[PDB]
Design a protein around this ligand. Sequence first.
Ligand SMILES: O=P(O)(O)O[C@H]1[C@@H](OP(=O)(O)O)[C@@H](OP(=O)(O)O)[C@@H](OP(=O)(O)O)[C@@H](OP(=O)(O)O)[C@H]1OP(=O)(O)O
Lengths: 194, 836, 49, 195, 57, 22, 456
Amino acid sequence: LLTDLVDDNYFYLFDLKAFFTSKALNMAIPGGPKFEPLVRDINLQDEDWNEFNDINKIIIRQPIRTEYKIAFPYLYNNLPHHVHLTWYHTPNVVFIKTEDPDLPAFYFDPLINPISHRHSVKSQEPLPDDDEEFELPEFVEPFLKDTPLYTDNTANGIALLWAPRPFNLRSGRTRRALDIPLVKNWYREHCPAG
Amino acid sequence: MDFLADLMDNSELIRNVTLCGHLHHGKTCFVDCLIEQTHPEIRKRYDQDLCYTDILFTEQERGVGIKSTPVTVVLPDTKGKSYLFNIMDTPGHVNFSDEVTAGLRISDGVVLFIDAAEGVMLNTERLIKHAVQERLAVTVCINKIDRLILELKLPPTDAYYKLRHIVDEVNGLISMYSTDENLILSPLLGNVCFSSSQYSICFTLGSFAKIYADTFGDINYQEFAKRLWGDIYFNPKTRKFTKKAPTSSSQRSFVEFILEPLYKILAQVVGDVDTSLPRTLDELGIHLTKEELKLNIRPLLRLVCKKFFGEFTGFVDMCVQHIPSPKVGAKPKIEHTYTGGVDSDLGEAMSDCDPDGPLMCHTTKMYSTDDGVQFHAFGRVLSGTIHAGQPVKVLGENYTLEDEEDSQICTVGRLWISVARYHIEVNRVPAGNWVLIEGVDQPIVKTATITEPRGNEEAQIFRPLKFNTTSVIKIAVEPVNPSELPKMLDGLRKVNKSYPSLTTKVEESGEHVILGTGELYLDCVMHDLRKMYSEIDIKVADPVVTFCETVVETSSLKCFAETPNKKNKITMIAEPLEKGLAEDIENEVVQITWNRKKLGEFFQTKYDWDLLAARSIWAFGPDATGPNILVDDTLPSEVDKALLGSVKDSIVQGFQWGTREGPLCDELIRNVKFKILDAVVAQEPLHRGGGQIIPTARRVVYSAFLMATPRLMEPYYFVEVQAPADCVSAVYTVLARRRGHVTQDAPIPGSPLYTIKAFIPAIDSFGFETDLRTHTQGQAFSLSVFHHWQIVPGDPLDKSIVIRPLEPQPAPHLAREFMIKTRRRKGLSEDVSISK
Amino acid sequence: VGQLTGMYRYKYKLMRQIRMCKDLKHLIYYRFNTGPVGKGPGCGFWAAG
Amino acid sequence: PNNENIVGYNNKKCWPRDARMRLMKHDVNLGRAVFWDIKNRLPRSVTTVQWENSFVSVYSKDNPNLLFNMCGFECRILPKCRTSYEEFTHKDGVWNLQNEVTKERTAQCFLRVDDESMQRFHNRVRQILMASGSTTFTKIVNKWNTALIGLMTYFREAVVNTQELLDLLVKCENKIQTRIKIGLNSKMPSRFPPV
Amino acid sequence: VFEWDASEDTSIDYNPLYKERHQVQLLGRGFIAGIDLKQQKREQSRFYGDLMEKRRT
Amino acid sequence: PTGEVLSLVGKLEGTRMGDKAQ
Amino acid sequence: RRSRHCPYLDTINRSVLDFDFEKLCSISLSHINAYACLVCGKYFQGRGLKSHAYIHSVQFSHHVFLNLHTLKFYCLPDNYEIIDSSLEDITYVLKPTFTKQQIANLDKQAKLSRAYDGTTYLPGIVGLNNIKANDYANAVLQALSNVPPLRNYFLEEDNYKNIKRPPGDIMFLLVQRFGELMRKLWNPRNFKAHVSPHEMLQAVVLCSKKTFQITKQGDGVDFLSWFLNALHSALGGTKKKKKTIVTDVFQGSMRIFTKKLPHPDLPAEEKEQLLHNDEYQETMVESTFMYLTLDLPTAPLYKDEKEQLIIPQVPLFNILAKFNGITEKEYKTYKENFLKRFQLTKLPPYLIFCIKRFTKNNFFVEKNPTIVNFPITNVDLREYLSEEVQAVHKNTTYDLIANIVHDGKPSEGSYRIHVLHHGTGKWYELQDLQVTDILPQMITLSEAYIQIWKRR
RNA sequence: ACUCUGGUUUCUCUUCAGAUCGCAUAAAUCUUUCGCCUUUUACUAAAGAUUUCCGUGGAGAGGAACAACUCUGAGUCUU
Ligand SMILES: O=P(O)(O)O[C@H]1[C@@H](OP(=O)(O)O)[C@@H](OP(=O)(O)O)[C@@H](OP(=O)(O)O)[C@@H](OP(=O)(O)O)[C@H]1OP(=O)(O)O
């Protein structure tokens, strides 16, 4: 029942802000819904051929689409009254959840590109000569040596980090069964092709 | 609180540093963590970020930094000394690079935030290059370390490999730009610092070694840290640090003592809160209450890391040890920034950063209050102390020791120190600080030098703020109601003050064009204009880029012009300049301030030019650093030299004006070499005046340029896109649609994401970000920066072509269209008149 | 509900619900009946309506 | 100085953007100048000419269409020399203007029913319908027929290009039919026949 | 009207880029809600599967 | 067969006005 | 050092110089170092190499420029200063500096000032250019410019300068621009016969928070009251001075006898006992008034029986019957009626009357057309002062100095203004660019709106 | 390593609700544009204004639970 989406970058121009912008600008995202105009402006919809918007002066290389105007509400459209600025690009949350349980929680999955550590320049940095003066007390140890690196719950918890809203809370409050739209995120995504 | 003001008296316990990095690399989050550490009453919400240091509505709504924000704050050091820090929270977006530079000019040091998972990316490379240009101290902070644990789950050995690869790449990039090898970066040196700003992790090798010491005692954290990175291994049999692994499957010291505890402390909080967390929490001395253990994973992890790592002393001691104080670091700042130089008496006075010396402040920032009708200056005090309610003498960008017109006497009212949103008012500010100044908005335009009147009359200005990128996007702006045109005009002034690289220019036809770097830059500019400054409805034309004008062939015949007196006749020829030479002049590789021997040696040696021709070079193009050359070529056997030198200057201004406004595209002649092949100078001074020669020089330059077959240079943006592997093919097609050619596609090491670097025409780059983001469903993100002017396909002087309206013309037509419509946007004639 | 009851005849604003519910059906069936399961009257995901 | 002459410039909104007058600054200024010159000749007391109740349309290099309005006809002239890719004939709202010397199709005349005429016709139908509480059906039908023949004979060739007029005509005819049907029975027929 | 008119459709695009939206692989391990996992596995382009098998040692 | 009058916009453009009249 | 030898003084043409414009560069829109090209009158960036002035000089071959902020002339293509006495007229047009003797002599000045174009005019009475149908502001400013003490206070820049102002204060911009505009009005050497108040209108819009807009035709009374209060507030130190110039010119002291009225639908005994309850008793309140609001009596609303359709006419004394104990005024407040009767205490040296027109009725706003009949020569106000305060006062005779009239309906009206010239005694009526001499006989034959009177 | 610390649940009541009262979502009335139009009653779809309804949090008050020590912490808590 849960869309396996890690971050909200999927809803770039397909979120609440973009839909509010589309409703305000009397236009619609292709996948988005069609609204009635926020204000009629029937006579003001088609202004006269001025010398400012002279189509002769306008250089055309790629058409200015509805998505352009919605993404930049104050740049590609005129009189943006009651318009909402969409959230810009969030960091790409690349999180590879484990697939086979018989695998360490920390593991270089083949999806990650190999570093392939090069040594064209021999890594040289100022560090004193080997094993000559410094000797730690025997009682000084790494902070967590008795604790194992990862239990069987570590991978599950890491997966639970990047999970939808109900499934990323240790605790929470109780909501009525009425107030739980099980397919709200189903139609909030783009319609599948075909 | 009073200690905050008193600490400004000491010029060594202050550090002027700017936080710069790529887009969304935790800079704002880092400043929020610092604020929370120093402000008990300021705490971020569990799910929503603090969003501190971002006060603009656009900053919060868009989520991208817009305006660099000043943060003054007192932080204890690792040893326990309370230093004073001033931080430029700068936008990471490349389109706001100018906003970095305004904070970069008045900053002693640079903290470069790099995301651990993302990599270096483009704005980081540009930032380190540009900071090398100002020769600032460089420190690197690999932020978002948790993304190597909680996102990629890389093994700690691979995590060390990734961190070392990033550090080596940064060091190599710096070595490719900075000659001084002292800028090597390593965590053991105190340069590289590790951090995850979401969970309030901020440690260097010294900080973690000090944590070890406080855990155990009698440990030299400095010498321990000096052995906590690289191919060094640890032996518990001898408790000894070696350069070889004591066993076969041993781990490196950095992994063994630093990465491993961090991995386990994160894993026990993300996976075993109810089972194993209390044991490891009591083991490390962290005592969390029953209520505190009931928080979600992220707030609990932030809380435990705050309790464990404590203060952010790693960042503090990094800045103290590697970023010079204003008192000691003023000398390179004066050497590179001030026009008069350190040699002059004022240079010596301001190099010492004397609080009792002559008053001198350098304002490079303008901030708009709630009303927006009275801007507030913001700048560095480089000498003396400015006082509240005091008369000052403000200089301008064009001010020289001769021209006193650019100055103005203004009374400075109450002044304060800006701590992000809240600023503390202070009666005075000593040297080396960053100060908000009131009452000087009217004479200050962008860069400003403020000095005291009735003294130090031989005071010059600092060099104008130089920006990395060339703003090429241009949008015409008009008022919906012309009866309300003045208001919009007023608003224009405000934005011209607010945005350092914004250029508002009124063309001949009356179109108020605005120059912006990119789509988001102009979007924010016009949002501010509509909603904050003008408060009236505005109209935007369709975006278009500027164009440059060049030649590709030698002028067929020498073109001559004559003064209205018909006694001075100047005959010139037109040729293109050599490859890279225009870039050399652009990057100030060679300057007109060079003596003739040095410039001649450069031209004759590197570019194989004639020695006499190299000595025959007169001047540069549109500005002192213009990419066009004006070279004398009058043979001494026919033309007198001393007499020609009298009008040489006037011909120089004429040629500069001609290159400024090109005959073809009305502006910006680029990459053109002009040789004066004949000079007939009237023997009397009154027949060779500037008002007579300069128009003649413009006419002869135009004739020479137009006789040679001209070409239009459109700006090509260098766009790199970081995207998953499956989206690379789609990005290829999207770039192919907009006439862009792909250069490189390199998978990012230590991450499953490719990075594709390509060149796309700026005129075809509009909406490219949105197109790519929506076409790949948000997986492919792009940033655009100006790279280089390139010849547009087509011939601008082929009149057999017909321009079909409202249709994308093919490439062979483009140039013609690109000029003809441009002329219509200027109100100019339909075709270029060769006779004129 | 519209076919079984026809209560929209006495309050036409109620059609707003019906047009929604049918939509939810089209939202569910083409997710429900995607793979080897063919089109048929087998869905029982009645929470939305 | 502020180029305010374009604000108060009446334009024939009934035409598309390209067909409508292009408000170039030079042409707007010229139209204002022509109107001011004409207004100067007439004394302000013997008569008056007000700008807002006027239309000045200039054909020049920028403007390819001459727009005018007379006798309830909104007409637009497009010379064939510049912007006439096809001199078609099927469109019956087109007057193939012919020079008396060259005897060629130099210009194309597009006709339209004026908005004031449409408003007057709608008002006439409205007052026919609302003044029918106590009135025979034949009287109503005769009044509607008279109005319709007057409009169609006066504005022939101008209906075809005024799709709004076609919609208004069919709407008013449906109004008349609905009024008659309500007169017959106080309930709308479901499948009423046109016979 | 019980059903919805086809004219109400908003996803009408002349641009092939928007007509053909690049499906997200979700790192080859995520699955869109509702659709059975087997159908998506046999439907996904398996570019990530090919990359994994090439990098599987 | 509804009995309502339909608007002939976008209709019967294959016919002129002078047709069906002598 | 080749000054005093400029061969380009001939190219200067004073006709095309309009210095009323805001001093901003025609290209960069910058306020710093404004330079005007005397050939064309357009401002530029400033004197310097590769500047807008330099570009204009090398393009259009214009060789003479004037520094707006410096009042000094330069040549850009040759870049040298100009020191001539022939250019001083342009300097005075740009920056009219009035000496004390000439400021005093304006009252006794009786010479017809001649402009450059030849349209001889009078100082002070100079046509104001309407911009976007806001003649009310122009009429109010023209009326205010006729006051002698205000003219003395505002004519010289340093008279209202050298005071402390709040750092965030923008009201001082308006008060300092009023002086500039008014010394342009009183300048007897204008190039053009008229004065453009457009900069003043822009400053009014900037300081008024979008009210009194250039587009909208606001009420003259409200604009005058707001302007007077704003001018009083701006002047002085950081704390308001008790007696500013506006206070000593227009403000007077007046007394209100406010008596609460019981509900009229109450028993007589209950009304009497409420009156005895000390709540519905008379209370005396002193106050300061910038002007006196004159309430026009009710229109006849019916045709006169003998001579039908006669415009009502009221003597000035019936309106002046207010402000005394004998006459009350039952204010019909929506909550309860008030029995307020006024009484003048201390007359100002200059008196402002505002005849209340444009009264909003229960459904819309209508303009009362009742005309007031007054003796223009002089009026007596000693009879409208209480016996306690008549000992201090010695000059209660007032003569009409300025008259404002509104012509037309409230929706679209024209603000005309008659002003009395002190030097000649003539009345001049000016409406936008139009200026005409009007006989004092038919001054009262108009819908008087705002009257400015001098106690002499 | 100590003495006192005194529960939590649940049923109500009374006020305040700032905050996504609600990680959910209705209806009605009124006022503007509307679409149908022919009379109410249903309506078309956007904006604006209230209102009712299914819910919610906090505070305070009054019960029961029902026990009960303690939890916990003020500290000297000690080798
Ligand atoms: O659009 P609706 O009125 O909601 O009808 C739909 C639809 O029918 P139509 O779109 O043709 O009217 C399908 O039924 P089919 O007629 O296409 O079989 C659908 O099921 P599928 O999309 O899986 O075909 C479903 O049918 P059901 O709910 O019976 O599975 C339902 O039809 P009904 O509304 O007639 O039930």
